[PDB]
Structure 1
């Protein structure tokens, strides 16, 4: 695509993600950055044969269905292709569920290895709320 630095910060915002269970808007921004480089169409197969889907790289073995990962559950009751939409709502919604799963933002490798415990706000500096 891809998405824009502040295009996203603003898009995640009014989807009510800015302080969502503690996590400043900046973390999601920074998460999107490293998981997919703001590419909504991003896809990545893991070793277990599963595939990571979308801007926040959401896995098929749990949250979304792709008819290609046996022994998987589709926890967000949604097909994985809908996560590849330029519309963000699907992705955000399913993300919101992943953060309250009990383990928080740590559910993203990229985040807790490139965002966590760092100045996370610089990611939304200058952007129009």
Structure 2
């Protein structure tokens, strides 16, 4: 499923991401836009044998089990396939653990490269939240 911008914003706001750990809703919407372009089916294979899954591109090396990543840990206790659903609940709950893992939102390279330090409030424009 491909979320509309405000549609995703509402869904995330609904799952408690606005200001979570001090990160405004805009940050999360911006991260999602550049990580997966709001596509819940997005997947990206990495050259290290791992793969990034879903709307927030969570990595199979440490966060979810996809049964084909060497020395993988399943810290979120879920199959990576669950991160490819139309319901973002799984991704958000796992993301909440990642953002608290000692690097803030720097864990998402696309966020760091295209959202960090910018006027992220723009990603919420026109939304009736």
TM-score between the two structures when normalised by the length of structure 2: 0.99
Report Cα offsets for 1:64-96 as digits up to 9, x if no partner.
000010100011000000000000100000000
Q: Give 1:2 deviation, angstroms.
A: 0.7
Deviation at residue 31 of structure 1 after TM alignment: 0.3
Q: CA RMSD in A?
A: 0.5
2: CA distance, partners of 1:88 / 1:70: 26
1:8, distance to aligned residue in structure 2 (A) = 0.3
The alignment covers a number of residue pairs equal to 129
Cα-to-partner distance string for 1:47-75 (whole Å, 9 max, x where unaligned): 10100000000000000000010100011
Superposed displacement of residue 126, structure 1:
1.4
Give 4+ residue runs of structure 1 displaced > 4 Å after superposition. none
Unaligned runs of 5+ in 2: none
Say which SS state the counterpart of residue 22 (structure 1) adopts: coil
TM-score (norm: length of structure 1) = 0.99
- The alpha-carbon deviation at position 10 of structure 1 amounts to 0.1
For residues 30 and 83 of structure 1, the distance between their equivalents in structure 2, rounded to whole angstroms, comes to 18
Cα deviation 1:27-62 (Å, max 9, x = unaligned):
000000000000000001101010000000000000
Alpha-carbon shift at residue 11 of structure 1 (Å): 0.1
Post-superposition offset of 1:14: 1.1
Match of 1:98 in 2: 98
Shift of 1:20: 0.1
